[model samples]
Target: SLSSSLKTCYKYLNQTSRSFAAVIQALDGEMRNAVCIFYLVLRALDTLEDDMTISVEKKVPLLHNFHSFLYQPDWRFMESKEKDRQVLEDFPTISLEFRNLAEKYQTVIADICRRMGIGMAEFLDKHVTSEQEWDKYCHYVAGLVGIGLSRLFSASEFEDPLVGEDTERANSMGLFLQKTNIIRDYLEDQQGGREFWPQEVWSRYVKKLGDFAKPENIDLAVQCLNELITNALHHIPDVITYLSRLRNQSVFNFCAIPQVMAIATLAACYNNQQVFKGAVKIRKGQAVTLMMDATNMPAVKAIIYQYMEEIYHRIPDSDPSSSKTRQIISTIRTQ
Candidate 1:
């Protein structure tokens, strides 16, 4: 029987992130509970990582030593995003499930949390300077997420040749998704004063990052955005190959759905000026289309192909990414 405490944590996870809950809920039996707890644990850590009120003095130690939180059943952070406040308030229940998990599952979740906590600590007081810095920062926050999820999937009864590939390959999955969110969140992050868009890339487009938001800068801003979109698109073939090897039907849908949604999201935002002004997203109608149709490889392949071609059509002559975009379109088709 599922314990009452875990059931409450599941309720909190459902409330905290519907998108994450959808994926976690798709896993079977023990795997669902394991991944659910893993996600909530990270969310607990991220609440710490994202809380600016936690002084740099306070934040580093909290982040670096967070793995130990799993061992303490009643632990809870006093401050977090309002949406996540309930999760933190109920942290003991979340930890109880983590402690109850099989040791192999516990080992994977605990090990990743320790490393991710350290990585979060290192980046707490810095800016993304170079592209390398951007990748390193993202690797700590998101790329390792791909690696950890792969390990968890294997730790579940489902193993795939593609899920736990080399570090670089697995990292690309997380990086691609993170870059898209970074692009979409540009204005919000800037306004909130938590910028992560790298100076290395954005510097080439505008004097001040905020300048990209101006109407006059649309041409260059859109071009800069396209290049970032292109950078993300380069990861598609790898993701397709990664999904191609999944043996479990439910896990395949869980993984494939997000990648398709990301493709559709990029397509909707491609060359559109809304990215700089506010949030950009696929219409609810299109999102439902993806959710309904993305149940298998051939269908997902069709969906990704549809979006890349949309991107190919939108690229104008002499746009910087035009050639590269064309090359990727062809490369994706061949895969």
Candidate 2:
């Protein structure tokens, strides 16, 4: 039964995210298992609070008490309209695995849940319009995930560079991925009644966020999209420096590949007229190529440089961020 449940827990991990699942599955063992379980717990919690169909009264308590739910065997919150609904319903199996993890793993997982859960609950009533608030929301949903994964790897003594140090670097790791997703997923989020793009950024282009969807405003939408993509690019240097500190091969591949994918994703989305219409992702052939090239630091750097070139060449002069985009290109460091 123990082995059987682990399979189910991991199966859900695969279904949650294809890119992340491929990386997590690549980790050696303890770190692999720990991260898989960590992702699911937070995903389940996120799924709960993100489901607009659930009344505030129903989700608020679960959001506040989510960390506590980690320890109780058989705990479940199966009523979610989100895509990760399977992770919630399969909580019992996941909980069983969580209970079996080492005390250090349990501590990190539970602590992130405690902190992120409360943080997520706080902003339910307000929208994040400013850059600072956007950073804070990303911190709760993703920055903590990066830190928690760092802690998990450090626990196994494989990630000495991040041995609970450099919170800023870790924050960049999470922010880069989260911001890229938010930028590319505007249409999906709009259809789903979710709006995570900060008003501070979008307001510069359109009065109403949905106006970007109108065919008449596609030019403005692409401009606004490029600006957001520029904001995400600011994190790439920190991301590279953070990646350079890693020592282990498997861990390096696991972390490096995703950052590469994020950049490739941004390359695919950069001033691309399609972003205003639907989801933007790298091709399957390109994804496999990235997976293959993620074996070493030099290749990783090359992949990043390639994407940087893609973004730089595509910047439109008519766009407001054209100068800043050129300036950012001058700042790109391949070291």
Candidate 3:
């Protein structure tokens, strides 16, 4: 029989991130437990960072010191309006499951958390000012996730060490997914009083990033949106390289499905003005189809190719970023 605390960890995993729960559950052997614990630990940390009610002075130290708290048995964070508060409230149970993992897994989890917490805290005081800074923010929030997952996969002995060793390609895997969401979440982030689009990119078209939501300014909004999408497309070459190296079928599926969904989402969002007005996503039918078909590398490439083609066709000659967008799509096609 499974221990109660481990069972509770899975329960929290299911509630906290439904999109990931299915694939993580499908993972082979103890790898499932390792990933579940890693995810909850990070989610708990993210909950702390996202809580607006927490004062900056308090939040900064909490984010900076989060990794050390993983070793503390009674370290629980009680005040958070974020939806994943249970992970923080019941953190002791999750930490118990984390401690129960092998030392190798423990080390990887703690190290990544240490770096990620510091990175998260650093961004709190500054706005993303440049294209490079945007990449750095996404790297902390998402690229580290790719790296930590790769490390865990390597430690599981199911994949070659090279799979985890290539941080560049793994970082691209996270960037592609993260950039997709940033592009799609313009309105929601604006209303939530957050700014993620880099000033270097958005200032060229409008004085304020939130101005893109204005119905009258949609033409410029589409232009700015296309430019960001073009920037996101550059990461796909690395994504292709990373997914090609995975050996374990379950691990490949867990990694590849999200990537395939990201490309499909980019296709849906490309030059679409709906992004500024509300959420944009691939249809449920398309989502289910990609999940089912992205089981192998060639199939995954085919899905990505199809989406790139959709985006290419949508780009009219008048759009500011059409030339670069076309070039990236052409490069991915040859890959």
Candidate 4:
């Protein structure tokens, strides 16, 4: 019965993402349930956070209300609110149903938020306008997701011993995926009037690239992207560790696919002017090859490490940002 719910949850979340879906389908039941629950809850919160239409006043209360939605069966009524109403309208019926089931696991969901919220609130208090601030923000959001995932896995009987040590490495898996999205969506975020690029990083480039029509900011925009790609690569070794720890072929596949997608994303974006010109993604055939190759443990590790090296090679050796990232990667690889 619970297994069915878990599968439903995975199916729901994976439906929109072919790459991530492939990985989810590769998991064992318990591990799949854990990952599915984590993703659904976090994604729900993320959806709320991204909704600009909701005022901060509305947003905070709704977030608080998520506790009830998770814990109190009767609290399901709250889903009717305009804020949550859209969640139903937008997502498939299965996702919404799983979200209802998620309400039954409020304790698990609440604990995740409690652990992640502390980091998120602390980082948000700091003005997130610089590259350093952006790092802090990503850490709070994506990095902390890793921590929650680690805690969830720790409590589960299915957890792999190799991945359990230094739970921080597990947390980095989420951070790497999230950071890649942040970098990839730079232009789109800007178009929507959201400036996620740390002001420090953006200031170094042109004043703003959000208004993509401006020809003058093009070069600086590319440079800013290059810097973000470099920053994102710093977490590669941790991602490698996360992948290596997965004993399940499906779980590894689920985890590896996005990472491979992320690597390909970085490679495509690095020093490429097309990012400023338009959206970019890896082709279907390329993605299939990456997925097939990722099934081999040694291949997964080698591929991720090789991608990291390629990123380093492309960025100037003297760039401080690149140097810092390289140092971090070296530290993780040697560990």
Candidate 5:
């Protein structure tokens, strides 16, 4: 689907970072190209988010211009305050090589960017307060990426036909991954003046702390962290089903590794106060070991389901969130 030069560009893109390289190497050629394009587009948006200097008024228009600019050979020279100026400078040269593939999938890529822009705009418009609202907010900002990935998977030649109907199952895949990031980056986000955890969920702890620096509130904060992980686990089954439906080994490997990594992250996060202390990541050796274990389809599914079940047991029946959790579990079993 991609030209050789475009493929070469993708190799460079993946090679730019180790984590990205690991994920890309796990994917087949077509899937890799699709994901590479998706990541670049998403990263462009992320760069915008990180730049607090830009007003929403200015940012929205830039996002709207992305699709058109992506197709234009010379648009790469346009200056921006965002990071990756060099990438933008070379985009014309790099992108020209992928013109054919870009043209072929122009509508798909454009549609995904447009939808993501719309969702991001909506999140920025509202000041989120409730846990429910925050969940919905994350769904719009990140969960929709799952929807985009599902569409990409269906259209890509590398996708398995059997998994094609499991788009809803694929929907939660990105949510789980994104939620893990949210859990792991809680302190960093708070320090950056970005609070992703809903105010309602953290209000009690904040009240106890009087100030965020209060040591007395650590226990309550830990509890809140557990609740967040429990909530994240609600999406694991859908991820497992989506993975099970994949026909290609490389594609399956690509999907499975992230899901596995997310679970491993959760396992590490369970009752661990260090999650709040710093950036915690799975070691490369441990990651490789997880991958080795995940190669077997039945084993991977069983392990994921078992992990979900254990997480499910942790939620009390009296908890209001239990209803949604149970509903998600039921949906996965029926599927």
Candidate 6:
């Protein structure tokens, strides 16, 4: 029965991510189910790429055709040796529910998936070097997701039509989050043999991105860190612009909380050597407070301003990016 498949889908959703599960469950009505399926389909597609054991030869083809499998009856993937393999193992259940969505939702999900899959494959053969490529990589991985969600929100009639129409601002939503995550995960990615930081920025400090992790490179690494944070702050104006246009409370909360979380994280990481040495994260207690408080535009703006001040006050005048960083913060505050 359809109900049985949906229950299984929720189980996989709950298992894959704690942060996303909490926010996603907070969504409203059929919109909740639609986002859930969208998350799983993409999660499984990502799983195909995450499993290092799979040969690139096998993975590229799978990524290229990931979206088509959504409509392919009873399609499933096994042999994935990754942490969240359940989604791939039981992809049929996820695809079944995907097929059950309204055509409007289905079109948005399928198109994003198809586009993201090709994007994923393209990056498979390259490295992120320039800031331009950095934006492209993040867009492929996260911005497309933002675009799809906006379309779904508009299609559901829960938001203004312009909410989906403004692709550039929606793309900023994803870029802000993605950049924060890449900045925070510097050590983790380097240790895992995956490097996402652009050479254009990091090369100015350390000779290699992983060299930033060395205790000897602490001061220089923090300089590079400040520069990246400055680049990320550029997206805030667009994020504020995008969120200000939303008409639905649930969608607003869903979008606003993550944006607040990203800014808070950048505050924690700004000019801090802790990021390259190990993990840098906002505390769970602070995150819980943000989830509750970021329900409206004014509160969200206040939260963003608070963190921007934290970063601004910490910016060393001699750091190369200090003045530009301050300028971006002032722009956010004034807007």
lDDT of each: 0.81, 0.85, 0.91, 0.62, 0.66, 0.90
Model 6: how far residue 141 lies from native, Å? 0.2
Highest-lDDT candidate? 3
Tens-digit lDDT track for model 6 on 1-335?
Answer: 24999999988989986776878877887799999999999899888876778888999989999999999987888899898899988898899999999999999999999999999998886779999999999999999999999999999998989988999999999999999999999987788778899998888887888899889989999989999999999999999999999888889999998899999999999998889776676798999999899999999988999999888888899999999999999987887
Candidate with top TM-score is 3
Better of 2 and 5 by TM-score: 2
The C-alpha RMSD in Å for every predicted model, in order, reads 1.7, 1.9, 1.0, 4.5, 4.1, 1.4
lDDT per residue, candidate 5, 43-83, as tens digits?
66566555666688977776666656667787664455666
Q: Which stretches of candidate 6 lie over 4 Å from their true place?
A: none
| Worst 10-residue lDDT window, candidate 6 | 17-26
**Reference-based TM-score, model 5:** 0.80
Candidate 4: count of backbone clashes, pairs at least 3 residues apart or interchain? 4
TM-score (C-alpha, index-matched) for candidate 4: 0.78
Candidate 1 overall lDDT versus native? 0.81
Between prediction 1 and prediction 4, the one with superior TM-score is: 1
Candidate 3, residues 101-127: lDDT per residue as tens digits?
999999999999999999999988778
Off by over 4 Å in 3: none
- In what order do the candidates fall by lDDT, top score first? 3, 6, 2, 1, 5, 4
Residue-pair clashes, model 1:
0
Worst 10 residues of 4 by lDDT: 74-83
Residues 192-281 of candidate 4 have per-residue lDDT tens digits of 656666777766656554644366767666766777777777677777767667665655666677778778778777767777777686
Scored by lDDT, model 5 comes in at 0.66
- Give the per-residue lDDT of model 2 (tens digit) for 91-160: 8888889999999999989999999889888877777788888899999988888888888888888789
